[PDB]
Design a protein around this motif. Structure first.
Motif, PDB file in Angstrom:
ATOM      1  N   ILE A   1       0.883  -1.158   0.000  1.00 28.54           N
ATOM      2  CA  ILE A   1       0.000   0.000   0.000  1.00 28.54           C
ATOM      3  C   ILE A   1       0.898   1.178   0.000  1.00 28.54           C
ATOM      4  N   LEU A   2       0.805   1.990  -1.057  1.00 29.58           N
ATOM      5  CA  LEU A   2       1.532   3.241  -1.177  1.00 29.58           C
ATOM      6  C   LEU A   2       0.439   4.263  -1.071  1.00 29.58           C
ATOM      7  N   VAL A   3       0.359   4.926   0.077  1.00 25.77           N
ATOM      8  CA  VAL A   3      -0.712   5.888   0.340  1.00 25.77           C
ATOM      9  C   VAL A   3      -0.462   7.150  -0.499  1.00 25.77           C
ATOM     10  N   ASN A   4      -1.483   7.983  -0.625  1.00 27.00           N
ATOM     11  CA  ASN A   4      -1.488   9.202  -1.414  1.00 27.00           C
ATOM     12  C   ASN A   4      -0.182   9.945  -1.401  1.00 27.00           C
ATOM     13  N   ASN A   5       0.312  10.288  -2.595  1.00 29.75           N
ATOM     14  CA  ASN A   5       1.493  11.124  -2.745  1.00 29.75           C
ATOM     15  C   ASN A   5       2.788  10.533  -2.218  1.00 29.75           C
ATOM     16  N   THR A   6       2.817   9.222  -1.992  1.00 24.89           N
ATOM     17  CA  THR A   6       4.061   8.536  -1.690  1.00 24.89           C
ATOM     18  C   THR A   6       4.922   8.685  -2.972  1.00 24.89           C
ATOM     19  N   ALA A   7       6.229   8.895  -2.831  1.00 26.67           N
ATOM     20  CA  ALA A   7       7.067   9.047  -4.002  1.00 26.67           C
ATOM     21  C   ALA A   7       8.326   8.216  -3.874  1.00 26.67           C
ATOM     22  N   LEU A   8       8.559   7.340  -4.864  1.00 28.00           N
ATOM     23  CA  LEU A   8       9.777   6.508  -4.984  1.00 28.00           C
ATOM     24  C   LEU A   8      10.600   7.179  -6.053  1.00 28.00           C
ATOM     25  N   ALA A   9      11.757   7.743  -5.670  1.00 26.19           N
ATOM     26  CA  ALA A   9      12.593   8.518  -6.600  1.00 26.19           C
ATOM     27  C   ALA A   9      13.078   7.727  -7.820  1.00 26.19           C
ATOM     28  N   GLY A  10      13.402   6.462  -7.628  1.00 27.55           N
ATOM     29  CA  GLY A  10      13.907   5.603  -8.696  1.00 27.55           C
ATOM     30  C   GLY A  10      14.745   4.497  -8.092  1.00 27.55           C
ATOM     31  N   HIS A  11      14.761   3.296  -8.732  1.00 29.41           N
ATOM     32  CA  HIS A  11      15.526   2.138  -8.251  1.00 29.41           C
ATOM     33  C   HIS A  11      15.150   1.774  -6.807  1.00 29.41           C
ATOM     34  N   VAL A  12      13.866   1.904  -6.440  1.00 30.92           N
ATOM     35  CA  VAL A  12      13.390   1.588  -5.079  1.00 30.92           C
ATOM     36  C   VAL A  12      12.787   0.185  -5.080  1.00 30.92           C
ATOM     37  N   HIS A  13      13.148  -0.646  -4.087  1.00 31.65           N
ATOM     38  CA  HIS A  13      12.619  -1.990  -3.947  1.00 31.65           C
ATOM     39  C   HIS A  13      11.655  -2.002  -2.771  1.00 31.65           C
ATOM     40  N   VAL A  14      10.389  -2.318  -3.026  1.00 31.06           N
ATOM     41  CA  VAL A  14       9.366  -2.378  -1.987  1.00 31.06           C
ATOM     42  C   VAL A  14       8.946  -3.841  -1.899  1.00 31.06           C
ATOM     43  N   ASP A  15       9.310  -4.499  -0.798  1.00 29.63           N
ATOM     44  CA  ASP A  15       8.976  -5.899  -0.585  1.00 29.63           C
ATOM     45  C   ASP A  15       7.535  -6.053  -0.099  1.00 29.63           C
ATOM     46  N   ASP A  16       7.046  -7.290  -0.106  1.00 28.90           N
ATOM     47  CA  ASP A  16       5.675  -7.662   0.227  1.00 28.90           C
ATOM     48  C   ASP A  16       5.120  -7.085   1.501  1.00 28.90           C
ATOM     49  N   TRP A  17       3.864  -6.650   1.427  1.00 28.38           N
ATOM     50  CA  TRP A  17       3.088  -6.148   2.552  1.00 28.38           C
ATOM     51  C   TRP A  17       3.615  -4.852   3.183  1.00 28.38           C
ATOM     52  N   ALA A  18       4.548  -4.115   2.538  1.00 26.96           N
ATOM     53  CA  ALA A  18       4.946  -2.800   3.070  1.00 26.96           C
ATOM     54  C   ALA A  18       3.769  -1.819   2.992  1.00 26.96           C
ATOM     55  N   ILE A  19       3.686  -0.910   3.965  1.00 25.20           N
ATOM     56  CA  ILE A  19       2.693   0.156   3.980  1.00 25.20           C
ATOM     57  C   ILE A  19       3.481   1.439   4.089  1.00 25.20           C
ATOM     58  N   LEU A  20       3.393   2.281   3.069  1.00 25.69           N
ATOM     59  CA  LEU A  20       4.041   3.579   3.084  1.00 25.69           C
ATOM     60  C   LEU A  20       2.926   4.589   3.251  1.00 25.69           C
ATOM     61  N   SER A  21       2.842   5.247   4.443  1.00 25.09           N
ATOM     62  CA  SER A  21       1.766   6.207   4.730  1.00 25.09           C
ATOM     63  C   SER A  21       1.872   7.424   3.840  1.00 25.09           C
ATOM     64  N   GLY A  22       0.801   8.218   3.807  1.00 25.67           N
ATOM     65  CA  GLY A  22       0.671   9.360   2.911  1.00 25.67           C
ATOM     66  C   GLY A  22       1.894  10.229   2.882  1.00 25.67           C
ATOM     67  N   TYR A  23       2.308  10.627   1.647  1.00 27.10           N
ATOM     68  CA  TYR A  23       3.431  11.558   1.451  1.00 27.10           C
ATOM     69  C   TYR A  23       4.792  11.044   1.952  1.00 27.10           C
ATOM     70  N   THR A  24       5.008   9.740   1.919  1.00 20.93           N
ATOM     71  CA  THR A  24       6.307   9.163   2.267  1.00 20.93           C
ATOM     72  C   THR A  24       7.201   9.359   1.021  1.00 20.93           C
ATOM     73  N   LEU A  25       8.422   9.866   1.218  1.00 24.12           N
ATOM     74  CA  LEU A  25       9.383  10.112   0.148  1.00 24.12           C
ATOM     75  C   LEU A  25      10.494   9.133   0.315  1.00 24.12           C
ATOM     76  N   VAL A  26      10.880   8.482  -0.786  1.00 20.32           N
ATOM     77  CA  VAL A  26      11.912   7.451  -0.733  1.00 20.32           C
ATOM     78  C   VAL A  26      13.046   7.794  -1.666  1.00 20.32           C
ATOM     79  N   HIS A  27      14.245   7.961  -1.096  1.00 22.60           N
ATOM     80  CA  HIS A  27      15.467   8.237  -1.835  1.00 22.60           C
ATOM     81  C   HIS A  27      15.746   7.082  -2.824  1.00 22.60           C
ATOM     82  N   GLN A  28      16.378   7.410  -3.950  1.00 24.10           N
ATOM     83  CA  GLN A  28      16.793   6.415  -4.936  1.00 24.10           C
ATOM     84  C   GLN A  28      17.615   5.313  -4.268  1.00 24.10           C
TER      85      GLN A  28
END
Ligand SMILES: N#Cc1ccc(CN(Cc2nnc(O)o2)C(=O)CSc2ccccc2Cl)cc1
Ligand SMILES: N#Cc1ccc(CN(Cc2nnc(O)o2)C(=O)CSc2ccccc2Cl)cc1
Ligand SMILES: N#Cc1ccc(CN(Cc2nnc(O)o2)C(=O)CSc2ccccc2Cl)cc1
Ligand SMILES: [Cl-]
Ligand SMILES: [Cl-]
Ligand SMILES: [Cl-]
Ligand SMILES: [Cl-]
Ligand SMILES: [Cl-]
Ligand SMILES: [Cl-]
Ligand SMILES: [Cl-]
Ligand SMILES: [Cl-]
Ligand SMILES: [Cl-]
Ligand SMILES: [Cl-]
Ligand SMILES: [Cl-]
Ligand SMILES: [Cl-]
Ligand SMILES: [Cl-]
Ligand SMILES: [Cl-]
Lengths: 258, 258, 258
Positions: B130-157
């Protein structure tokens, strides 16, 4: 040119007051009611059961009346109610709320909901509020009159935003914001009161003076919430604005932002 | 009502299963492949080379299959691969990835990518995320099973988000998030583990107990990552859930979020 | 294939170069002017008075040339000017600015404004800038050449972002950013100089050394702004790039990010 653009899709069950404008490539879904003088821009998605009042403005790329994720059962009646003289800017997303439990998503009058702001299911917005660009209400959020939420303010579910309160840009609110309080940061922290907004509203010097004293009682004199509430009782009975401040602290279910 | 809306644009090179639904004013671009039971809403932009699987739902104003920004050479083959039973909400942006060096953008099954979320080039999302509203993965991001990224979570490359992990709203993730770990703030900081999710997933009390002990070994006992990995070895060989945690710390290239 | 898609709306008062491309369901509103080699994608809203230069690319779901809230009186002349070779990505919002007071919103050349970025009224962007996804310039923001604002950077009204400066993702900028300075966090804090940017621009080793020396004078040697500017006078006279750094601190009105 027609008030209702021929390129728009209007469901036969939608009810629009005679002078309503709908821009090209907009969709007005089943069970959507639109009041007099409302202007729907182009590329707008309206889904129901939704009631939109009078003299509203809804801009392109908005999705107003989206599904409630909470549903206790498939087919549970949901509703979104929008009042009068509101401005809903581009890309805004507004979800409906459940009818049975009186948790419909409701918006009052004279509100400004700026670009890409999000209003989660069961949220209630009063009158004269400003939700700046990308402000997001997770769900079950109550925003009282004249609140200002600066750009990218994030509000945790069940939080209450007090009347005339203010959040700084990028604030992440996990707790209730008492009336008039200014909050900043991630996580949000109380700083002061929006005295500037009090003067614009025409609050008397005496009411502003009592509110400034009220803030100190709650935040600067080491009192517990229970102690603060008892110390404010006298001032609250004399100043309706102090009662507004005391009531917001009294009604805090997630504690107050400190 | 025709499955492909006559107002939609379907490129002659696109490949669709017979029951695919496409809404008005949607573009299914060249080299887009869409599987059985998928519903494309109105105003959607699909660009290829992209494969969208079965029983997906893609909402209005989404741009799925956008260009990889950093090719080694012009015309370098790229691809986006989306699995089955995913929900891509309104305004979501998903970029393709390079085929050559096995860095395609890939999304598995049963994911929920909420409004205006962004999936940067070469990102890999597993299943049940679940990638909540406005979550952003910059690039080359690995999200494994059942992760929950709450609203507006920013993830560095290049960051890795572990299985069953959780980020709080407005988190700015610059390092790897080990499996089950809960992270909050800007910059993100480790707080605990998502024991709630472990219980919903039916983990034994013994596995939860071993994971709680595992968190302390890594974070609360002044050990180095090398020291922690060595102490966790025995528990990891016994509980697959502890091996999931241990492996996420082992595979961390940006260090772990602390 | 017709350059102006027959499903686009071109206002009779709009002025276009002969080779301009306009995608389906796009609106080129009244008083919009578009230069040679510009490509407008589908679902774009262009509003005027706006001038778009040569070889620009504007992506779907963008609202370019929106109303300025800052209006002395109704009907006050407003304008947005965009130069050449810019890329405006999907969902980008750009507001016009007031003409009378030389406060029009202006964008120069070779800029990249990424998905859902927001350019507030009266903002001025130079050349070769990058505004990453969801960056928001509140209004009256000046962004000098080669500046990079990472994803979700928020910029307070009246702030100046110096040439070759950098903001980390999720930065909340409240004060001016001197040229070359790297800033991070909410509230933003000065960390170092953008040495990678200096290297990419082929700066001499002597210039990179004099700038590293300049940063320490301003931020890590316990000097006041007036003390720092006097010490810089010598290095600024010898190196034009140190003069760029000195000039940005000299011209600060909101204090410098520290
Ligand atoms: N109508 C109104 C209105 C607008 C903003 C505010 C509060 N406000 C300051 C401000 N006042 N006028 C302007 O333009 O900005 C912010 O939210 C700044 S952050 C921001 C601002 C705009 C876009 C994106 C971002 Cl991130 C108060 C009232
Ligand atoms: N399907 C689901 C789903 C949704 C959210 C979460 C995680 N979550 C808490 C929460 N749970 N239900 C609701 O509505 O919110 C947040 O991300 C809060 S922030 C936020 C939330 C919504 C919009 C904008 C913002 Cl900023 C977990 C699962
Ligand atoms: N053209 C370019 C360009 C892009 C980003 C940057 C700066 N940058 C790091 C980076 N470099 N390449 C990539 O993809 O990201 C970020 O803004 C990361 S955050 C982010 C990134 C992308 C989307 C959402 C978010 Cl939140 C610098 C130049
Ligand atoms: Cl707006
Ligand atoms: Cl919702
Ligand atoms: Cl602010
Ligand atoms: Cl398939
Ligand atoms: Cl959503
Ligand atoms: Cl990307
Ligand atoms: Cl949270
Ligand atoms: Cl936690
Ligand atoms: Cl639990
Ligand atoms: Cl031109
Ligand atoms: Cl507008
Ligand atoms: Cl982009
Ligand atoms: Cl603006
Ligand atoms: Cl960063």
């Amino acid at each position: 040119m027609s008030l209702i653009d021929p390129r728009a899709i209007i469901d036969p069950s939608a009810r629009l007051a005679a002078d309503v404008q709908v821009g090209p490539w907009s969709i007005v879904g089943a069970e959507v009611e639109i009041g007099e003088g409302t202007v729907i821009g182009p590329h707008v998605v309206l889904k129901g059961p939704t009631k939109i009042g009078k003299h509203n403005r809804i801009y392109q790329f908005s999705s107003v009346g989206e599904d409630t994720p909470d549903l206790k059962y498939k087919g549970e009646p949901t509703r979104l109610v929008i009042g009068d003289h509101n401005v809903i800017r581009e890309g805004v997303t507004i979800h409906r709320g459940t009818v049975q439990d009186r948790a419909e998503t409701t918006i009052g009058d004279h509100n400004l909901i700026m670009a890409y702001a999000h209003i989660g299911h069961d949220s209630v917005i009063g009158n004269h509020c400003i939700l700046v660009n990308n402000t997001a209400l997770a769900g079950h959020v109550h925003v009282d009159d004249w609140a200002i939420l600066s750009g990218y303010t994030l509000v945790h579910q069940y939080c209450r935003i007090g009347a005339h309160s203010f959040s700084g840009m990028g604030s992440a609110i996990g707790k209730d914001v008492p009336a008039y309080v200014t909050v900043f940061g991630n996580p949000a922290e109380a700083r002061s009161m929006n005295f500037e907004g009090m003067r614009r509203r025409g609050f008397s010097s005496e009411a502003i003076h009592a509110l400034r004293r009220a803030y100190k009682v709650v935040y600067r004199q080491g009192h517990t919430v229970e102690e603060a509430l008892a110390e404010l009782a006298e001032s609250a009975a004399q100043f309706p604005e102090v009662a507004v401040f005391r009531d917001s602290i009294q009604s805090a279910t997630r504690g107050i932002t400190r």
